[PDB]
Design a protein around this ligand. Structure first.
Ligand code: HEA
Ligand code: HEA
Ligand SMILES: CCCCCCCCCCCCCCCC(=O)OC[C@H](COP(=O)([O-])OCC[N+](C)(C)C)OC(=O)CCCCCCCCCCCCCCC
Ligand SMILES: CCCCCCCCCCCCCCCC(=O)OC[C@H](COP(=O)(O)OCCN)OC(=O)CCCCCCCCCCCCCCC
Ligand SMILES: CCCCCCCCCCCCCCCC(=O)OC[C@H](COP(=O)(O)OCCN)OC(=O)CCCCCCCCCCCCCCC
Ligand SMILES: CCCCCCCCCCCCCCCC(=O)OC[C@H](COP(=O)(O)OCCN)OC(=O)CCCCCCCCCCCCCCC
Ligand SMILES: CCCCCCCCCCCCCCCC(=O)OC[C@H](COP(=O)(O)OCCN)OC(=O)CCCCCCCCCCCCCCC
Ligand SMILES: CCCCCCCCCCCCCCCC(=O)OC[C@H](COP(=O)(O)OCCN)OC(=O)CCCCCCCCCCCCCCC
Ligand SMILES: CCCCCCCCCCCCCCCC(=O)OC[C@H](COP(=O)(O)OCCN)OC(=O)CCCCCCCCCCCCCCC
Ligand SMILES: CCCCCCCCCCCCCCCC(=O)OC[C@H](COP(=O)(O)OCCN)OC(=O)CCCCCCCCCCCCCCC
Ligand SMILES: CCCCCCCCCCCCCCCC(=O)OC[C@H](COP(=O)(O)OCCN)OC(=O)CCCCCCCCCCCCCCC
Ligand SMILES: CCCCCCCCCCCCCCCC(=O)OC[C@H](COP(=O)(O)OCCN)OC(=O)CCCCCCCCCCCCCCC
Ligand code: CUA
Ligand SMILES: [Ca+2]
Ligand SMILES: [Cu+2]
Ligand SMILES: [Mg+2]
Lengths: 534, 66, 55, 102, 236, 51, 45
């Protein structure tokens, strides 16, 4: 018991620890966004007693927890470590001891970020940590150091895990499976592992150089020694954009499996889906300065970055039309995973179309630090990547756990988050176009209207999260009963039209990936004689 | 099963009611209103803006309170 | 004898795509000629009367 | 896949004669109704005579039920029931509306 | 000039640069509405008809005609709006034949203005600092978090060059109704141009997180006539 | 190393055959997560002299 | 020839009801903030 969970070398057990830590962290990051939305409900001091430093501290904590401690350890640390070895026939990962250190650095990085908010005054800097606001003159004491060490520990985690993902895919495939025969979810973790390998080392240069200015009398970014603050932004954003794609592509591969299963059709143009995922991962290294359109760059620099940013809309739109082509002419089964996937196609398109407006440098003059930007990236990260994370859990957890969930309770949960997420973020575009800046705890009185509407939706969506916590409890205590009563779905594919009920019992599963052919909780020794395909 | 969609619509409408009524209870522990959020103060704001010719084709009125 | 029946689903994807462009093309037509052209003509009336006050 | 309609009938006629149990007759029937066309009357006749040879009446009832889903009008359903008149009568196959009348 | 409650559009424009920014926003939204009309319609009429389809079309897996066509169509749309977007980019970057230059410097939670053309009758530098009026000191009718104790006065119909920098950390000079937004970085000077076509008061704010006082550092600009500006200049 | 197989065997926590109800573990674990932002606020508002 | 009614009449009978159901859904998803402003103090006094 001690050595199964502290000494582990099994990739399935480690993936369970990842998901446990990932979900404990989304609690804290949701609680911070609730405190933030209560202080923005009306003009004046509301709940924080006029402490503007504390409001800024909670905004940094909110972004770091959601990105580096929820979405990455769950989509990649969780689903990647559990389903990638099973989908290719591997008996383990390569490097099983590397696989274990890449988890145990995240608990130590949390007891570095939490103690950062409790020491002196915390880090009220934004998640980008620009200098000179984050140097020792404008932020004294050890708070910004402890936040940098936390970011260092998440980079060790993601880099070590990426090296392991790349070797396993290239070296440990089963008999007959060639690189053209991989499932689309395996392709999405493989391409993501390469973006992490080529972007993380540039971020570790930028924030280690920021640590040197603060404590070792160095002038990379200090203006009195010749340094330049605009250098830090080039180094930070050269990792940033690749990161947003490191957060959506694993969700692109989940959406492919769910949509194909509940249509009873194979993915339309499956080979052009891999080519599109590779083109988006390559064009995500050539567009980073759309995040610096107003800092004073040249006009010919800005005209290049406009056209480079726009052309990533072509490969992404191929994936959107491809997904609509597989459900056309299908036999659609509206279980809970299918509901999230259909909402993803509608809410991701909206968030991506507000990005096309932002891509032009001329128009971004009216769209800088404007709530309009906040509206763009919560449509693609919270109705995007988050919706694909719910779709995954409802798709694979009955197999992984051996326990079913209450179906009609889960459709109530879906509608409560779909309604509540739209109420928070749709009026954010109205505030931004009229000119409301971001990162403020207080505003002029003409912005009170839409700010009240968004704070109401924030309560609707937190209630939907508390219903999900109860659904987990019901699945773990009543999961075996959910199979014998009629409170859950047993088969994600139903018999075909002319297929009789008893013929269907000969082959219950019609799957194009291995994972649905294992025992319900898969065995700890899953393959002895290797699997074989033609 | 038959009768499940109606349970779903009733559960969604009961979840909307509970969250909205909980918001109004937490609001009652919030801080006092700002001194400028009145109709009397907002009508002298419009006096100043009408002189300076504010927003000459889309409106300048600040009145949103009681 | 019964003549063959083919291409039912092929020809109903042509009408879906034609309908989608027509529907999205009337929402966009109102935005330009109804909403945007409305604000342009108000603005151009404020200025064209401002020049007359300069005589 | 460039298969003409004439090649479609001549290939599934051959495929219904080789089916040797219920699994085979139901699997071949499933693939025949999954294209973008309604099988010809001469294909439906061979699918009825294949379910007789494995001794299964519900599979022969479902043949005409799929036929009424795949046609475009209700006058295309009628013209099939008027071509396959003897065979439905000679083997004793009822229609699903005739069996569960409403 | 001022934000309004429940507004869902641009504040009214006072310069040709903000006139052009709005024209490009509306031109782009014409095509984003065609695309959203298609995608939402195909999504709706696929769920409503194939959730009741008992036999799936499992042998449709590719198409050469539609896949080429839907790769070219987004490229034509993207090219249509890049033409006016490039023209606006180079029309706003030019600063040719201005008649006056003003410097604006950002500080830890106030602004600072300097006139150094030496046009006034005594030929000095005119300079003052601008602070937000605190809540405890407001007079009834003044606007919270917007009105300042001093403002910047400019004339109308005059081309103006703005020079922006900073003293301690990064700030941002921004006024929504003038089409102005530019970072203020310690160490370098950026420039922007303007030409105001009507009189009035235009409000802005700092737009680069600068610490606890990031919300208490507004910008207020008054545009007056030429004889009226010379009288104000020659006194203060 | 050889481990066991089954339903409740691939998780680190005990759900059945325990003395204390599993509800105290399940909701206590997610309560502590939801409660760390409020502990931070308390320390910092007690430093500014607001309390 | 062709048996039955024209494919235009058959397809017309299926799509016309769906056009109206589409426009009544997209109006709710995009026009629901218009109702909040309808019952506000700021509106029309
Ligand atoms: C992962 C990304 C992510 C997510 C999910 C969210 C979710 C939310 N965010 Fe935030 N947000 C950011 C990333 C994210 N945000 C970033 C980067 C910033 C900018 C920081 C900066 O300005 O410096 C930001 C800034 C930001 C601000 C700006 C504050 C200011 O400028 O100072 C506001 C304001 O309201 C806000 C609100 C919200 C709200 C209300 C939600 C809520 O609506 C959430 C709704 C849904 C949920 C409740 C989450 C689901 C719950 C889970 C635990 C999932 C579990 C699932 C399974 C395991 C299957 N966010
Ligand atoms: C999941 C995360 C995610 C994703 C996927 C994206 C995707 C895109 N983003 Fe975004 N972005 C963020 C997360 C993300 N972004 C965050 C967190 C910030 C703020 C950071 C911060 O400041 O803290 C940000 C900010 C940001 C900026 C900086 C703006 C500013 O700060 O002032 C820009 C600039 O251009 C941008 C544009 C785009 C574009 C063009 C895409 C494109 O990939 C979108 C393409 C998708 C589509 C276009 C939809 C479907 C397409 C079709 C159906 C084809 C047909 C279409 C046409 C013909 C037009 N976003
Ligand atoms: C079909 C289309 C969709 C259908 C549409 C469905 C959704 C429709 C939404 C419309 C409802 C929106 C109401 C908004 C909430 C509200 O207005 O609250 C009113 C006030 C608080 O509002 P406030 O103005 O922000 O308070 C000011 C803060 N001070 C100054 C007090 C410190 O509250 C008060 O102080 C007085 C009220 C006190 C609370 C009692 C009210 C009932 C709550 C009972 C609690 C039940 C649940 C709690 C269980 C613990
Ligand atoms: C703050 C200062 C910076 C410190 C850097 C972080 C320190 C964390 C790691 C501490 C070193 C302990 C040894 C573990 C490594 C190991 O043992 O590699 C040995 C592994 C063992 O394979 P196996 O046992 O898994 O399989 C069992 C098979 N017998 O061979 C491999 O994988 C092959 C590939 C080697 C790649 C090693 C990469 C080096 C790790 C450090 C990477 C840090 C990147 C960030 C750089 C700043
Ligand atoms: C995959 C790898 C991708 C490599 C990225 C290279 C693409 C560059 C295209 C834009 C270039 C441009 O056009 O940049 C033009 C701008 C001009 O700047 P300015 O306006 O101030 O000129 C004003 C003149 N006074 O130069 C820059 O900003 C420098 C950016 C250079 C990029 C360096 C990248 C090095 C990669 C190291 C990390 C390795 C991992
Ligand atoms: C101009 C921009 C257009 C954008 C359109 C984007 C719309 C997104 C919605 C996509 C859903 C429909 C799926 C495609 C249907 C399909 O599956 O087509 C594939 C089928 C399969 O043919 P086959 O393999 O059997 O024979 C071999 C064929 N070479 O051929 C068709 O049906 C023809 C479709 C008509 C062509 C489109 C004409 C557009 C005008
Ligand atoms: C709020 C509570 C309101 C009571 C509603 C009673 C439901 C009626 C009923 O008893 O419903 C029976 C259903 C069983 O579903 P059924 O299909 O078997 O019965 C239907 C027959 N057709 O159980 C439920 O719904 C339980 C509902 C629980 C709701 C949330 C519980 C609390 C979650 C938040 C706390 C966790 C977060 C804490 C961590 C921070
Ligand atoms: C969308 C605008 C409003 C959204 C916000 C309010 C939502 C309504 C509140 C919850 C409704 C509960 C209804 C009960 C369930 C039900 O309806 O079930 C009825 C049917 C089938 O069940 P049955 O009747 O056959 O059997 C009943 C046996 N007891 O399921 C459905 O069709 C589900 C529809 C799936 C939709 C997918 C997700 C939709 C979001 C995507 C965006 C849509 C595109 C937008 C562009 C057009
Ligand atoms: C808050 C989180 C949302 C939880 C949703 C599940 C509970 C919602 C209530 C519900 O759905 O009540 C629906 C059921 C009625 O349906 P039924 O039991 O007859 O079953 C067959 C389906 N017709 O009434 C109950 O359960 C008993 C009372 C529950 C409390 C109602 C709350 C109303 C205020
Ligand atoms: C997903 C992101 C979407 C981006 C949307 C951002 C906003 C873009 C600009 C939209 C202009 C709205 C018209 C203003 C009407 C007005 O005049 O408003 C009037 C009132 C208050 O007005 P008032 O009293 O203050 O003064 C003026 C008094 N006449 O408000 C409202 O009725 C709110 C109604 C909301 C409007 C619906 C918006 C529909 C646009 C859909 C966009 C689709 C996105 C395309 C793909 C990305
Ligand atoms: C506090 C109780 C003490 C009681 C005193 C003992 C007296 C005898 C009582 C018997 C109980 C023994 C107590 C032992 C501790 C215990 O069983 O539950 C206590 C455990 C804690 O311990 P932990 O091992 O999980 O480590 C963690 C310690 N930080 O809570 C929990 O994690 C609850 C967690 C549940 C939430 C996880 C939900 C995830 C589901 C898995 C889905 C995975 C999907 C994967 C997809 C990739
Ligand atoms: C896709 C998802 C769609 C979901 C639909 C949204 C419904 C969920 C609940 C939304 C919360 C409402 C916020 C109210 C905040 C408030 O307090 O409003 C205050 C305003 C008055 O203003 P005041 O200045 O006096 O405030 C004073 C502050 N103390 O009173 C109202 O207007 C009542 C609310 C109106 C009801 C409309 C609800 C939307 C339903 C849309 C139906 C379809 C419309 C189609 C139009 C074409
Ligand atoms: Cu100066 Cu924010
Ligand atoms: Ca406030
Ligand atoms: Cu970006
Ligand atoms: Mg900025």
């Amino acid at each position: 018991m001690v050595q199964r969970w502290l000494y582990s070398t099994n990739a399935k057990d480690i993936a369970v620890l990842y998901f446990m830590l990932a979900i404990f962290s989304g609690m804290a990051g949701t609680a911070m966004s609730l405190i933030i939305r209560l202080e923005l409900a009306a003009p004046g001091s509301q709940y924080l007693h006029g402490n503007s430093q504390l409001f800024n501290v909670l905004v940094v904590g909110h972004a770091v927890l959601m990105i580096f401690f929820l979405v990455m350890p769950a989509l990649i640390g969780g689903f990647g470590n559990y389903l990638l070895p099973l989908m290719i026939g591997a008996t383990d990962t390569a490097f099983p001891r590397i696989n274990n250190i890449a988890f145990w650095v995240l608990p130590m990085g949390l007891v570095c970020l939490v103690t950062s908010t409790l020491v002196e005054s915390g880090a009220g800097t934004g998640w980008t940590v620009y200098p000179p606001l984050s140097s020792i003159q404008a932020h004294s004491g050890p708070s910004v150091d402890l936040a940098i060490f936390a970011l260092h520990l998440t980079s060790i985690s993601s880099l070590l895990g990426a090296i392991n993902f790349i070797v396993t895919t290239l070296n440990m495939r089963t008999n007959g499976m060639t690189m053209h025969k991989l499932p689309l979810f395996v392709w999405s973790i493989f391409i993501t592992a390469f973006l992490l390998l080529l972007s993380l080392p540039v971020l570790s240069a930028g924030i280690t150089m920021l640590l040197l200015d603060r404590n070792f009398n160095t002038s990379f970014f200090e203006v009195s020694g010749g340094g330049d603050p605009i250098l830090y932004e080039h180094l930070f954003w050269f990792f940033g954009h690749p990161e947003v794609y490191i957060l959506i592509i694993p969700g692109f591969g989940i959406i492919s499996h769910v949509v194909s299963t509940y249509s009873k059709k194979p993915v339309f143009g499956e080979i052009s889906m891999v080519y599109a995922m590779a083109s988006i991962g390559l064009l995500g290294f050539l567009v980073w300065s759309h995040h610096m359109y107003i800092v004073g760059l040249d006009a010919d620099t800005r005209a290049y970055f406009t056209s480079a940013t726009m052309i990533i809309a072509i490969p992404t739109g191929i994936k959107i039309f491809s997904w609509l082509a597989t459900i056309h002419g299908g036999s659609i089964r509206l279980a809970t995973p299918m509901l999230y996937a259909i909402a993803f196609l509608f809410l991701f398109t909206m968030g991506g179309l507000t990005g096309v407006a932002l891509a032009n440098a001329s128009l971004d003059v009216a769209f800088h630090d404007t709530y309009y930007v906040v509206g763009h990236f919560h449509y693609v990260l919270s109705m995007g990547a988050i919706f694909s994370l719910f779709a995954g859990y409802y798709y694979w957890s009955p197999q992984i756990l051996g326990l079913n969930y209450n179906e009609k309770l889960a459709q109530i949960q879906f509608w409560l988050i779909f309604i509540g997420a739209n109420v928070i973020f749709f009026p954010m575009h109205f505030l931004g176009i009229n000119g409301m800046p971001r990162r403020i705890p207080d505003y002029p009185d003409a912005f009170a209207g839409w700010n009240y509407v968004a704070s109401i939706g924030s309560f609707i969506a937190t209630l939907s999260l508390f219903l999900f916590i109860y659904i987990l409890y019901d699945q773990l205590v009543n999961g075996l009963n959910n199979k014998v009563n009629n409170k859950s779905v047993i088969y994600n594919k139903a018999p075909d039209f002319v297929e009789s009920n008893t013929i269907f019992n000969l082959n219950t599963v019609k799957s194009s990936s291995i994972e649905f052919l294992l025992t319900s909780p898969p065995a700890v020794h899953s393959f002895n004689t290797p699997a074989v395909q033609s | 099963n038959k009768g499940d969609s109606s349970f779903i619509a009733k559960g969604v409408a009961a979840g909307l009611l509970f969250s909205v009524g909980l918001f109004a209870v937490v609001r009652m522990a919030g801080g006092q209103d700002a001194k400028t959020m009145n109709k009397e103060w907002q009508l002298k704001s419009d006096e100043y803006l009408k002189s300076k010719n504010a927003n000459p084709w889309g409106g300048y009125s600040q009145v949103q309170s009681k | 004898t019964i003549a063959p029946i083919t291409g039912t689903i092929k020809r109903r994807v042509i009408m879906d795509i034609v309908l989608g462009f027509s529907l999205g093309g009337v929402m966009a037509s109102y935005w330009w000629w109804g909403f945007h052209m409305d604000k342009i003509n108000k603005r151009e009336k404020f200025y064209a009367e401002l020049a007359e006050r300069k005589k | 896949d460039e298969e003409t309609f004439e090649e479609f009938t001549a290939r599934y006629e051959k495929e219904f004669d080789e089916a040797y149990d219920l699994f085979e007759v139901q699997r071949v029937l499933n693939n025949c109704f999954s294209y973008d066309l309604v099988p010809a009357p001469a294909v439906i006749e061979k699918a009825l005579r294949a379910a007789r040879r494995v001794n299964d009446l519900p599979t022969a009832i479902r043949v005409f039920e799929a036929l009424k889903y795949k046609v475009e009008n209700e006058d295309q359903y009628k013209a099939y029931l008027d071509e396959l008149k003897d065979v439905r009568q000679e083997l004793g196959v009822p229609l699903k509306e005739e069996l569960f009348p409403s | 000039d001022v934000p309004t409650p429940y507004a869902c559009y641009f504040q009214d424009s006072a310069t040709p640069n903000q006139e052009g920014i709005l024209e490009l926003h509306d031109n782009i939204m014409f095509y984003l509405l065609v695309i959203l009309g298609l995608v939402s319609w195909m999504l709706y009429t696929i769920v409503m008809t194939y959730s009741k389809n008992p036999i799936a079309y499992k042998y449709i897996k590719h198409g050469q005609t539609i896949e080429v066509i839907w790769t070219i169509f987004p490229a034509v749309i993207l090219l249509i709006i890049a033409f006016p977007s490039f023209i606006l980019l180079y029309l706003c970057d030019e600063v040719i034949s201005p008649a006056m230059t003003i410097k604006a410097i950002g500080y830890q939670w106030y602004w600072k203005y300097e006139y150094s053309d030496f046009i006034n009758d005594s030929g000095e530098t005119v300079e003052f600092e601008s602070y937000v009026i605190p809540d405890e000191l407001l007079e009834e009718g003044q606007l919270r978090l917007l009105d300042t104790d001093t403002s910047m006065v400019v004339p109308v119909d005059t081309h103006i060059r703005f020079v922006v920098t900073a003293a301690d950390v990064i700030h941002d000079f921004a006024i929504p109704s003038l089409g102005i937004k530019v970072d203020a970085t310690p160490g370098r000077l950026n420039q922007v141009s303007a030409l105001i076509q009507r009189e009035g008061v235009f409000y802005g704010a700092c737009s680069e997180l600068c610490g606890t006082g990031h919300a208490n550092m507004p910008i207020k600009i008054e545009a007056v006539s030429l004889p009226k500006f010379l009288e104000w200049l020659n006194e203060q | 190393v050889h481990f066991k197989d089954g339903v409740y065997e691939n998780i680190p926590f005990k759900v059945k055959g325990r003395k204390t109800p599993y509800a105290l573990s399940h909701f206590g674990f997610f309560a502590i997560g939801f409660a760390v932002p409020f502990v931070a606020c308390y320390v910092q508002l007690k430093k500014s002299g607001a309390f | 020839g062709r048996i039955g009614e024209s494919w235009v009449i058959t397809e017309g009978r299926r799509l016309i009801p769906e056009i109206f159901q589409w426009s009544a859904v997209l109006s709710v998803c995009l026009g629901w903030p218009g109702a909040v402003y309808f019952f506000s103090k700021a509106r029309k006094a």
